[PDB]
Amino acid sequence: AEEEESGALRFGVLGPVRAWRDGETLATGSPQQRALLAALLLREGRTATAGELIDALWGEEPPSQALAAVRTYASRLRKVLDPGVLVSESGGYAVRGLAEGALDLARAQDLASAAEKARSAGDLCHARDLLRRALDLWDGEVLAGVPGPYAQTQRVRLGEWRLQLLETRLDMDLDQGCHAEAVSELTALTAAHPLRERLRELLMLALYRSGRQAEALAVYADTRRLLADELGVDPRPGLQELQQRILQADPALA
DNA sequence: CCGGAGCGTTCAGCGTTCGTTTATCTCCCCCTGGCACTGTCATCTCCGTCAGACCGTCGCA
């Protein structure tokens, strides 16, 4: 609320895509219109051609006379948005005139970069606040209810990036000494994510430093059984190494 | 000792919202046509290969 500048236009892509003019929300429109807006936004104001926009929205099988569909989608964007924010260059469209902090993806990138810089500088409270601000950006699943293979690719990429953000965040939480909340939320996540090995290693190191051991090795046994049932292979050697060093009761982690 | 209520799932009435087209309205690109004092023949090449042949050409005999 402290950065609510007058005349500032804010866009939301990390969840359901939305447009905010000075605090009031705009009617984005149809799901394909929303996906076109997302495709034009994530390129950081780079000119995307109409054929590439068609490929991003629809993929391999477009209808024959539906370039005018993208034309009227862009016209509806220019209706909803400013006349000058969306510019037409070389037959394509680009969302220009965006100030800093306008796009939530760029804000997340800057927050992650600042968190990494503070990790390099060793500042725990500052990077903790930066990651707290970062996690308060996306609401629910990214790109909710939009079609297209580009939308699917962005969805899975940003979900994976959020997974690594949670991994780094909670590894730092185990570094600073936050046991209870970490154990609870990682139990919830591994209930949601059954085959994510990194989060389960985080559960192992968290429970080893929290005074709880039985459910830790129970989760580990379930992990090996499910990984053998669904894949037929052996888990990563780092998980076995950390479990072995847990078994010998090494006081370095404690 | 079935009976009712609450709960789970599954479909037919109309009610709104999308997906994909269509003709009209600005802005730009691109091609053909107009210019009415008179003004009516450019242009520098090319040299210190080179080595002799092959060949047709050509005027003298």
Q: Using the CB atom, is residue A73 less than 7 Å from strand B? A: yes
The dihedral region occupied by A169, where left means phi > 0, alpha psi between -120 and 50, and beta the remainder, is: alpha
How far is it, in rounded angstroms, from Cα A10 to Cα A111? 17
Q: Using the CB atom, is residue A6 less than 7 Å from strand B? A: no
* Chain centre to alpha carbon of residue A140: 10
* Residue A91: C-alpha distances to residues A70, A74, A186 (Å): 11, 12, 48
Give the per-residue SS3 of A118-176: HHHHCCHHHHHHHHHHHHCCCCCCCCCCCCCHHHHHHHHHHHHHHHHHHHHHHHHHHHH
Query: Separation of CA A16 and C1' B15 in angstroms?
Result: 26
Provide the resolution (angstroms): 3.3
**Could you say which nucleotides of strand B lie within 7 A of any protein CB atom?**
17-23
Q: Using the CB atom, is residue A76 less than 7 Å from strand B? A: no
Query: Separation of CA A146 and C1' B10 in angstroms?
Result: 28
Q: Which residue is nearest to nucleotide B18 (CA to C1')?
A: A30
The angle subtended at Cα A51 by Cα A62 and Cα A98, nearest 5°, is 120
How far is it, in rounded angstroms, from Cα A57 to Cα A34? 10
The half-sphere exposure of A138 on its side-chain side, counting CA atoms within 13 A, is: 23
User: What technique determined this structure?
Assistant: cryo-EM
